[PDB]
Amino acid sequence: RNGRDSEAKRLGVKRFGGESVLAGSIIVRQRGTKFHAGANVGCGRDHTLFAKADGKVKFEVKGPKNRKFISIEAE
């Protein structure tokens, strides 16, 4: 009665902290907002976080909930 599975979705972090990225570059693929969009980062319809400017990726923990945000520090 078992024997089924789905294709692996290649989620996860594509660009880690301090990496130089071009605008448009995908930083994380995820299901929901496990990471949140900080400065110069957009959030796509499938919760993909992507760079809206050229610069370096920065992960940070901010807010009252203590949420993982991703920003781009512009070069």
Binding mask 39-68 for RNA (x = CB under 7 A): ---x-xxxxx-x-x------x-xxxx-xxx
75 contributes a contact to RNA by CB under 7 A: no
Q: How far is CA 50 from CA 7, 27, 33, 64, 71, in A?
A: 23, 5, 13, 24, 9
Q: Which does 73 bind (CB under 5 to 8 A by kind): RNA, K ion, none?
A: none
Question: 35 vs 2, 5, 53, CA distance in Å?
Answer: 33, 26, 18
Of 12 and 63, CB closest to K ion: 12
Tell me which residues touch K ion (CB under 5 A): 14, 25-26
